[PDB]
Scaffold this motif. Structure first.
Motif, short mmCIF file in Angstrom:
data_model
loop_
_atom_site.label_atom_id
_atom_site.label_comp_id
_atom_site.label_asym_id
_atom_site.label_seq_id
_atom_site.Cartn_x
_atom_site.Cartn_y
_atom_site.Cartn_z
N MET B 34 0.83 -1.19 0.00
CA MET B 34 0.00 0.00 0.00
C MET B 34 0.87 1.25 0.00
N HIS B 35 0.45 2.25 -0.77
CA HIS B 35 1.19 3.50 -0.92
C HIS B 35 0.31 4.68 -0.54
N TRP B 36 0.96 5.79 -0.19
CA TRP B 36 0.29 7.07 -0.01
C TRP B 36 0.83 8.05 -1.04
N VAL B 37 -0.08 8.82 -1.64
CA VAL B 37 0.27 9.88 -2.58
C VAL B 37 -0.56 11.10 -2.20
N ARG B 38 0.01 12.29 -2.40
CA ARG B 38 -0.68 13.52 -2.05
C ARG B 38 -0.48 14.55 -3.15
N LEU B 45 1.69 15.80 -8.44
CA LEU B 45 1.61 14.64 -7.57
C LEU B 45 2.93 14.44 -6.85
N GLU B 46 2.84 14.04 -5.58
CA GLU B 46 4.02 13.75 -4.76
C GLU B 46 3.82 12.39 -4.11
N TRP B 47 4.67 11.44 -4.48
CA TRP B 47 4.70 10.16 -3.79
C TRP B 47 5.16 10.38 -2.35
N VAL B 48 4.46 9.74 -1.41
CA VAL B 48 4.70 9.96 0.02
C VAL B 48 5.41 8.77 0.66
N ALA B 49 4.81 7.59 0.63
CA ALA B 49 5.33 6.46 1.37
C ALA B 49 4.74 5.16 0.82
N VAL B 50 5.33 4.05 1.26
CA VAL B 50 4.89 2.71 0.90
C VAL B 50 5.13 1.80 2.10
N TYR B 53 3.40 -5.65 2.33
CA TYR B 53 2.12 -6.32 2.52
C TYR B 53 1.92 -6.77 3.97
N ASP B 54 3.00 -7.12 4.66
CA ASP B 54 2.93 -7.75 5.98
C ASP B 54 3.37 -6.82 7.10
N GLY B 55 3.14 -5.52 6.94
CA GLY B 55 3.86 -4.57 7.77
C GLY B 55 5.28 -4.52 7.28
N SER B 56 6.24 -4.78 8.17
CA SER B 56 7.63 -5.05 7.78
C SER B 56 8.19 -3.84 7.04
N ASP B 57 8.84 -4.00 5.88
CA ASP B 57 9.58 -2.93 5.25
C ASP B 57 8.69 -1.73 4.92
N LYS B 58 9.19 -0.53 5.25
CA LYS B 58 8.52 0.72 4.95
C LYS B 58 9.52 1.69 4.35
N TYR B 59 9.03 2.59 3.49
CA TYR B 59 9.86 3.59 2.85
C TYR B 59 9.09 4.90 2.75
N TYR B 60 9.83 6.01 2.73
CA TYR B 60 9.24 7.33 2.74
C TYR B 60 9.91 8.20 1.69
N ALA B 61 9.27 9.33 1.39
CA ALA B 61 9.88 10.34 0.54
C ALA B 61 10.85 11.18 1.36
N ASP B 62 11.73 11.90 0.66
CA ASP B 62 12.76 12.66 1.36
C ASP B 62 12.17 13.82 2.15
N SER B 63 11.16 14.49 1.59
CA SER B 63 10.52 15.62 2.26
C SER B 63 9.51 15.19 3.30
N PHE B 68 6.23 11.75 9.31
CA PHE B 68 5.07 10.92 9.03
C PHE B 68 5.43 9.45 9.24
N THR B 69 4.44 8.67 9.68
CA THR B 69 4.63 7.25 9.94
C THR B 69 3.53 6.46 9.26
N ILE B 70 3.90 5.59 8.34
CA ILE B 70 2.97 4.68 7.69
C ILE B 70 2.84 3.42 8.53
N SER B 71 1.63 2.87 8.56
CA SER B 71 1.33 1.67 9.33
C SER B 71 0.04 1.07 8.78
N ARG B 72 -0.30 -0.11 9.30
CA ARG B 72 -1.50 -0.80 8.83
C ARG B 72 -1.86 -1.88 9.84
#
Ligand SMILES: *[C@@H]1O[C@H](CO)[C@@H](O)[C@H](O)[C@H]1NC(C)=O
Ligand SMILES: [Cl-]
Ligand SMILES: [Cl-]
Lengths: 212, 219, 193, 213, 221
Positions: B34-38, B45-50, B53-63, B68-72
């Motif tokens: 799952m990704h966030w875009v704003r 468009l600015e890609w935010v984070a990803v 699928y299982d939690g685990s690895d997360k990545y963010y944009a530089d800005s 911000f914290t992605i979770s699920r």
């Protein structure tokens, strides 16, 4: 961030033209470049990934090319539902990076605006403010100029503009210019003028009213 | 039947926090990343984070790293984006999307986030009355001025939807006051000024306001 | 005594793809190495850790002859401390490599009109190959945040790619046969002296 | 992709040397391995890397690969070497990176007498004829090497129908035993005056007869 | 010592599936590929494919692509091989072998093998008949008598004599697979001809796959 550069930032075309949009990568991204489509107000539609693989539903007239750092999107036989903003995005390495965007609008024939002026409503004047509105309706191209003259004196720093997106049918633009005043400044002057210039007018059109 | 419905967005003041949600159904949530875009108003468009699928690895944009914290929650089939240290650059429409075999094939509806110190205020509506000196046997313009409202979504309908042709609702402009203002106008036959009635309906859900305003001819 | 069968390594009719490169261990024979050096039908003959002249005078515990096919502008990656799709995902040489990398152009054998798409190389991997490791697996590579589960698609790629050798290709894109000779030291394989 | 073609059978005498050839184009391009499989057991690795032998493998085993043929030289041949010997390569020069074996080669060490077959033939039991069925049981025993050719005949005239014969199998003594069954109907047993089981070995012929009643 | 311990024998009817196990002992499971070899009865070895315990990735021969699945369990160091849509041609001993560390690729250590037999015959207990001795079965001083174990499936069958006391002279012969698919063997004992009436001869037969135990007295004609 890899950072992506699109070119051109905007362009116009007719229905049936073929159009190319360029997207450049600062670094080598192999062939992992995606293309998105977004129409004003709606959610983006993923069109292509891996530079050339179409997504489910995307028409084959959308063709993507490129490898390394230089990628191109070629849209053939342009159709009314294709005029939108297009973004590129590398999906080779995190963080994913989007492009600056390329706005694709229709070319259309030159049309002159119909100009209207609206004094402030008495319901508003009772509150203590005075908003005077000028309307430039159904013109093309979008480049227009609106000068506000209060008693043949040009106004500065007290008006605001708002332009619409191209209309679905006539593919025109429309502009709203609002002059903001306190009622004190308003009732101290007589004639209020909205001077408008545009490519389709032989000479500036003025619409004016006198307080009353 | 596959769906991504968002909630939580709204108005927050600078520095404070906000938790955005993206509820899922119609597919196996735990199978998909799952990704966030704003998108800031009028910006790209600015890609935010990803998030994996299982939690685990997360990545963010530089800005966006650090604030911000992605979770699920896979048991609730829900994706979250926590938002902190909020600045005007973060005022945007936030979309969640799922990463599938067929790309970002499904997206949320988008929830607005307006960071500013202003208070939720409903608009004042003023009629832009058509000129009684209208060109005769031609077209007449009239509309409604939707002034001083916050936060921004505003919907304008004409004659409760019966009047749709010739209508232009202008995008709102963020006034120096921090409030929003826009005008909606419509062109009508100059003859039917007397017979046909003309009402604008403005609704501002953030303040639960519904205004019907009478635009009658004037001298 | 016994002749080291270098001819059967070099003049083999078919060569393996680099992803599944072949290794033939050579042992219990008297190798004549100048047969290769003194006759240069090879485009590259780079040795590491030994000088090519002195190969007939040294003895080694074992010899390994690894053979495979790549394209010309990739022969540079068959060296210690190289990086690239080949050195990272296909054939990696160690930092303390003792041996020689031998290559020659095989356009007349491995290219055909219409394209020879038989030769494969690996495009991705989770980690880079350790020296002298070999990966012949064909699991769909998960480049994204979603499991592939066997279906190719967005960020889900088949790990191997074909070369596409056509005789008209530029020399940097033509096929090259490569023999890497690794000398294990510690006298089972010796020169004529 | 390539196929390794071994010789199906190679036979020597004790103390002699046996040579098993594994064949393939450019077989010297790869390393040939050799396994030994004794009847009713798992293969054991006898030669690896063309010539290297594992720990505890006798030196009388030796390997070589010189072009398009690899050979396993088993010298000073003992009795325990009587086995099936297979060669193997790893071939990735074809369509799919595969492990390939050869057809195998059986080593009949051929070092023992030429013992003749013992044959006993049994009529149908009375209980079986009561069950409306009949079976003649020809049991061949203590015959060496490990061949045999069987034939039935009703009043000297062969039968061929209802015959089911075992393949020769080694006994504890180290000779081979085999068995043959002839399925009859009760009437077919009583219709003829004598059924016979004939057993042929090398050049031998031993016939045993059984009559009804 | 590195040991490859497989699983027990399996009898299956055509169209079914089989899952053979192979537990590894004295090494690092995740450091060696596990290959599977197959051997038809009295026939050559046939390679099936390789499994990498670390990655879990596979590689099969085309002959089995689509009907074979080779898996693993890291927790209890066990490799699994599963063949589906079985037919009689898949009757074989199924072998488990460790590939060498050397990219040379030799199978250094093997397994005991698992026999899976594919046939359409259903489990049937054996009908046991006495093969009575005759003075025409003698050599003057010793006659021959036996028990015929007819029509059974599957193997094995056990034959003892006189309550497992008569052991000197027994000869139980290997079975035969008939055209019908059922097995038949014979068990014969060579006995002094001075004791056909002095002592009796019972034969004990066991077919555990059908829970069938039978005793047969063998009197003369
Ligand atoms: C390959 O063949 C050529 C021509 O016969 C020969 O001169 C050459 O030495 C061969 N290669 C090797 C390694 O012996
Ligand atoms: Cl393997
Ligand atoms: Cl796989």
């Amino acid at each position: 961030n890899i950072q992506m550069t699109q070119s051109p930032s905007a362009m116009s075309a007719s229905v049936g033209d073929r159009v190319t949009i360029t997207c450049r990568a600062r670094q080598d991204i192999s062939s992992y470049l995606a293309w998105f489509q977004q129409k004003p107000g709606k959610v983006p539609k993923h069109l292509i990934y891996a530079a050339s693989t179409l997504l489910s539903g995307v028409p084959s007239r959308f063709s993507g090319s490129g490898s390394g750092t230089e990628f191109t999107l070629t849209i053939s036989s342009l159709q009314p539902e294709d005029f939108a903003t297009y973004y590129c995005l590398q999906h080779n390495s995190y963080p994913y990076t989007f492009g600056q965007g390329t706005k694709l609008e229709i070319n259309r024939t030159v049309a002159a605006p119909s100009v209207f002026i609206f004094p402030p409503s008495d319901e508003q004047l009772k509150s203590g403010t005075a908003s005077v509105v000028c309307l430039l309706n159904n013109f093309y191209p979008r480049e227009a100029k609106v000068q506000w003259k209060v008693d043949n004196a040009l106004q500065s720093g007290n008006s605001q503009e708002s332009v619409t997106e191209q209309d679905s049918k006539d593919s025109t633009y429309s502009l709203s210019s609002t002059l903001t005043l306190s009622k004190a400044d308003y009732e101290k002057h007589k004639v209020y003028a909205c001077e408008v210039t545009h490519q389709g007018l032989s000479s500036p059109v003025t619409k004016s009213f006198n307080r009353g | 039947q596959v769906q991504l419905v968002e909630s939580g967005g709204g108005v927050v003041q600078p520095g404070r926090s906000l938790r955005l949600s993206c509820a899922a159904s119609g597919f196996t949530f735990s199978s998909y990343g799952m990704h966030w875009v704003r998108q800031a108003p009028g910006k790209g468009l600015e890609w935010v984070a990803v998030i994996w699928y299982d939690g685990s690895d997360k990545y963010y944009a530089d800005s966006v790293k650090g604030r911000f914290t992605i979770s699920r929650d896979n048991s609730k089939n829900t994706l979250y984006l926590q938002i902190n240290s909020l600045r005007a650059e973060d005022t945007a429409m936030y979309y969640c999307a799922r990463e599938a075999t067929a790309g970002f094939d499904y997206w949320g509806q988008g929830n607005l986030v307006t960071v500013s110190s202003a208070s939720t205020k409903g608009p004042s509506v003023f009629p832009l009355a058509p000129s009684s000196k209208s060109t005769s046997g031609g077209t007449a313009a009239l509309g409604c001025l939707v002034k001083d409202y916050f936060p921004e979504p505003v919907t304008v309908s004409w004659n409760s939807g019966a009047l749709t042709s010739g209508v232009h609702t202008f995008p709102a402009v963020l006034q120096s006051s921090g409030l929003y203002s826009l005008s909606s106008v419509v062109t009508v036959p100059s003859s039917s000024l007397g017979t046909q009635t003309y009402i604008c309906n403005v609704n501002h859900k953030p303040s639960n306001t519904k205004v019907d305003k009478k635009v009658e001819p004037k001298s | 005594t016994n002749l080291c069968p270098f001819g059967e390594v070099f003049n083999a009719t078919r060569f393996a793809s680099v992803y599944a490169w072949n290794r033939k261990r050579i042992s219990n024979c008297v190798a004549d190495y100048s047969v290769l050096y003194n006759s240069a039908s090879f485009s590259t003959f780079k040795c590491y850790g030994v000088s090519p002249t002195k190969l007939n005078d040294l003895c080694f515990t074992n010899v390994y002859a690894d053979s495979f096919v790549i394209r010309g502008d990739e022969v540079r990656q068959i060296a210690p401390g190289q990086t690239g799709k080949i050195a990272d995902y296909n054939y990696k040489l160690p930092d303390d490599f003792t041996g020689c990398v031998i290559a020659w152009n095989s356009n007349n054998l491995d290219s055909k009109v219409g394209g020879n798409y038989n030769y494969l190389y690996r495009l991705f991997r989770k980690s880079n190959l350790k020296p002298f490791e070999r990966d012949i697996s064909t699991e769909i590579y998960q480049a994204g945040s979603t499991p592939c589960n066997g279906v190719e698609g967005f960020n889900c790629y088949f790990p191997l790619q074909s070369y596409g050798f056509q005789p008209t290709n530029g020399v940097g894109y033509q096929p090259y046969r490569v023999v890497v000779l690794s000398f294990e030291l510690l006298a089972t394989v010796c020169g004529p002296k | 992709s390539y196929v390794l073609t071994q010789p199906p059978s190679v036979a020597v005498a004790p103390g002699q040397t046996a040579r098993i050839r594994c064949g393939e184009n450019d077989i010297g391009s790869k390393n040939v391995h050799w396994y030994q499989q004794k009847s009713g057991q798992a293969p054991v690795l006898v030669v690896y890397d063309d010539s290297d032998r594992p720990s505890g493998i006798p030196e009388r085993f030796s390997g070589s690969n010189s072009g398009n043929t690899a050979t396993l030289t088993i010298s000073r041949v003992e009795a325990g070497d009587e086995a099936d010997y297979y060669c193997q390569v790893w071939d990735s020069t074809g369509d799919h990176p595969d492990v390939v074996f050869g057809g195998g080669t059986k080593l009949t060490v051929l070092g023992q007498p030429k013992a003749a077959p013992s044959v006993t033939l049994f009529p149908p039991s009375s209980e079986e004829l009561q069950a409306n069925k009949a079976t003649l049981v020809c049991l061949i025993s203590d015959f060496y090497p490990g061949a045999v050719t069987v034939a039935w005949k009703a009043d000297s005239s062969p039968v061929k129908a209802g015959v089911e014969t075992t393949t020769p199998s080694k006994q504890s003594n180290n000779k081979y035993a085999a068995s043959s069954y002839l399925s009859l109907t009760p009437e077919q047993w009583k219709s003829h005056r004598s059924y016979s089981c004939q057993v042929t070995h090398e050049g031998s012929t031993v016939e045993k007869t059984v009559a009804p009643t």
